[PDB]
């Protein structure tokens, strides 16, 4: 019961018993917390509760020290001192932002703004409190039980009465009962078991509620600037392919950490792998939140780096299939590719943390705690999508609040910016450059004259709250009959239910905007589906149209984003 104050470090025996994370608070800080919030339970070796038999006074502001014990006003001896006096709470070794983080329910955007604008120690308290709240919320959902199994990919479910039903998308991962992790897609539902198992009737599924470990490391280590490249030894013979990044690679070696904003198709993986070639003896750990981001770095490394010095770290509790071409779980290979949640405790010359817009402060801290490195390079784009905030329902989370790295990129600017999009036709580049990049993103490709837009509101139906627009899919079907090259297009929309309908009617492969992030396709067909905050989000819109290498068709619901698209308009 002895520790350091989460607000000012001052040693104490006090912890707030009303806070879900029970943070250590020093006398001057514990007082400022109890006296300004509904939190009145204070914990020491023994709690601050009335020692008198049968008394239920637990409020610290109504308690006094009667010798060596604690008593309320009704039970205190004549010679007693109040626990709360002269701006402090009695304890050994004798905040407006801390109060809001400690008492908020994480359903408002302002709660996330505070968690990213507060002091460093309060960023860890906020990240731990938020993650713990997100887990206890998983318990609120009802259990799903198998009523009947139709096929190897379809079943019928029986839900728990009195408890709400979680959304049925790829985002919500269930645990079968331990028959492996399972996902569902919309009376027949589509099941996807991570482990192939003959679904038994009576078996049940629950969302995996995991224990939130405490955070110790900052989201960002303190910044250091050096006069020379430190702890890294550059090649003199550097491949022409990577010459464009030489100044940026030198910047990387002359700072403790560096941020790289890379818009779509500007060379983020190329930059990341080129760093290994520029500092050929450096041990580099490549990390990201998702298996897909880690695998994309592996694919790029497979092409430029010696395969024998690479290793893909995979947790024994395998959830999805991932990269197979490197030796698995060899922590000491020069190049280690691993998701944040699976990181071993190791050191490195450089840590490259990719797809930074998807990281949370919880992830930023975990990386600093598991990896001790000479240099940290954060790669991503605050104009792309953040990690879903399951509890957030009110307000929009702006990019400067996604995490500490995105906050830096949006306030002081990134240390490095990849300014030339090599993927997209110029119509797409020009649109997103003006939309989210302050006209700093340049097109490498010419206009393809295969980027089309159509303003068609159609009809919005809903599968619970996930939206469908059949008339927008009908417009796509008509377009496909006249444009056979587009037969190979990937269908993209902001909604899983829109994608499920489009899959049956069009037969095109399907992706939500969020799942398409990091991927590229020659042709993309996008149906906005609705005019909601979700489907109009500029970061989601940016990701949606930058998936295309050759052509894109956008069937739009929103006049604003439609008018912004620098595409050829189609009639009907
Ligand atoms: Zn303090
Ligand atoms: Zn508290
Ligand atoms: Zn009492």
UniProtKB/Swiss-Prot annotation:
Residues noted as binding Zn(2+) 13 in the record, renumbered to the chain = 50, 55, 72, 75
Annotated consequence of substituting residue 36 to P: In strain: Omicron/BQ.1.1, Omicron/XBB.1.5, Omicron/EG.5.1
Where a ribonucleoside 5'-triphosphate is bound, by residue? 262-269
* Residue ranges constituting the CV ZBD domain according to the UniProt record: 1-105
Residues annotated for Zn(2+) 12 binding in this entry: 16, 19, 33, 39
Q: Where are the LRR repeats?
A: 208-228
Residue span, (+)RNA virus helicase C-terminal domain: 419-572
Catalytic activity, reaction form: ATP + H2O = ADP + phosphate + H(+)
- Where does the chain bind Zn(2+) 11? 5, 8, 26, 29
- What happens upon changing residue 77 to L? In strain: Delta/B.1.617.2
The cellular location(s) given in this protein's UniProt record come to: Host endoplasmic reticulum-Golgi intermediate compartment
Which stretches make up the (+)RNA virus helicase ATP-binding domain?
A: 237-418
Complex formation? Interacts with nsp8 to form the replication-transcription complex (RTC): nsp12, nsp7, two subunits of nsp8, and up to two subunits of nsp13. Interacts with host TBK1; this interaction inhibits TBK1 phosphorylation and decreases by 75% IRF3 phosphorylation, which leads to reduced IFN-beta production.
Q: What does this protein do?
A: Plays a role in viral RNA synthesis. Multi-functional protein with a zinc-binding domain in N-terminus displaying RNA and DNA duplex-unwinding activities with 5' to 3' polarity. Activity of helicase is dependent on magnesium. Binds to host TBK1 and inhibits TBK1 phosphorylation; the interaction with TBK1 decreases IRF3 phosphorylation, which leads to reduced IFN-beta production.
Q: What is this protein called?
A: Helicase nsp13
Q: Which organism is it from?
A: Severe acute respiratory syndrome coronavirus 2
Gene that codes for this?
rep
């Amino acid at each position: 019961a002895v520790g350091a104050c989460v607000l000012c470090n001052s040693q104490t025996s006090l912890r707030c018993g009303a806070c879900i994370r029970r943070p250590f608070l020093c006398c001057k800080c514990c007082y400022d917390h109890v006296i300004s919030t509904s939190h009145k339970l204070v914990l020491s070796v023994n709690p601050y509760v009335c020692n008198a038999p049968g008394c239920d006074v637990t409020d610290v502001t109504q308690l006094y020290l009667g010798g060596m014990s604690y008593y309320c006003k009704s039970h205190k001896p004549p010679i007693s001192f109040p626990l709360c006096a002269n701006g402090q709470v009695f304890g050994l070794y004798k905040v407006t932002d801390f109060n809001a983080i400690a008492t908020c329910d994480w359903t408002n955007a302002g709660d996330y703004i505070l968690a990213n604008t507060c002091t460093e120690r309060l960023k860890l308290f906020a990240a731990e409190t938020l993650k713990a709240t997100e887990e206890t919320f998983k318990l609120s959902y009802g259990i799903a039980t198998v009523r009947e199994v139709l096929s190897d990919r379809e079943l019928h479910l029986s839900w728990e009465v009195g408890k709400p039903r979680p959304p049925l998308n790829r985002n919500y991962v269930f645990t079968g009962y331990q028959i492996g992790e399972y996902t569902f897609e919309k009376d027949a539902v589509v099941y996807r078991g991570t482990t192939t198992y003959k679904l038994n009737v009576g078996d049940y599924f629950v969302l995996t509620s995991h224990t939130v470990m405490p955070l110790s490391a900052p989201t960002l280590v303190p910044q250091e600037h050096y006069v020379r490249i430190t702890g890294l030894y550059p090649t003199l013979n550097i491949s022409d392919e990577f010459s464009s990044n030489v100044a940026n690679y030198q910047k990387v070696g002359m700072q403790k950490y560096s941020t790289l904003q890379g818009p779509p198709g500007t060379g983020k993986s190329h930059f990341a792998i080129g760093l290994a070639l520029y500092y050929p003896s450096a041990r580099i750990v490549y990390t990201a939140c998702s298996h897909a981001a880690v695998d994309a770095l592996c694919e790029k490394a497979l092409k430029y780096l010696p395969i024998d010095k690479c290793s893909r770290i995979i947790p024994a509790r395998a959830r999805v299939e991932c990269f197979d071409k490197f030796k698995v779980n060899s922590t000491l290979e020069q190049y280690v590719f691993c998701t944040v949640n699976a990181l071993p405790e190791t050191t490195a010359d450089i840590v490259v943390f990719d797809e930074i817009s998807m990281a949370t402060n919880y992830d930023l801290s975990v990386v600093n705690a598991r990896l001790r490195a000479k240099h940290y390079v954060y790669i991503g784009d605050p104009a792309q999508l953040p990690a879903p905030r399951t509890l957030l329902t009110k307000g929009t989370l702006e990019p400067e609040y996604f995490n500490s790295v995105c906050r830096l990129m949006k306030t002081i600017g990134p240390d490095m910016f990849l300014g030339t999009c090599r993927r997209c036709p110029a119509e797409i580049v020009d649109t997103v450059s003006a939309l989210v990049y302050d006209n700093k993103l340049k097109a490498h490709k010419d206009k393809s004259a295969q980027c089309f837009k159509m303003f068609y509101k159609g009809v919005i139906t809903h599968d619970v709250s996930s939206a469908i627009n059949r008339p927008q899919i009908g417009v796509v079907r008509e377009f496909l009959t006249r444009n056979p090259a587009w037969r190979k297009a990937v269908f993209i929309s902001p909604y899983n239910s829109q994608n499920a309908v489009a899959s049956k009617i069009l037969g095109l492969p399907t992706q939500t905007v969020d799942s398409s992030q990091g991927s590229e396709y020659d042709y993309v067909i996008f149906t906005q589906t609705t005019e909601t905050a979700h489907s109009c989000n500029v970061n989601r819109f940016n990701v949606a149209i930058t998936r295309a290498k050759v052509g894109i068709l956008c069937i739009m619901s929103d006049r604003d984003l439609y008018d912004k698209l620098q595409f050829t308009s189609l009639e009907i």
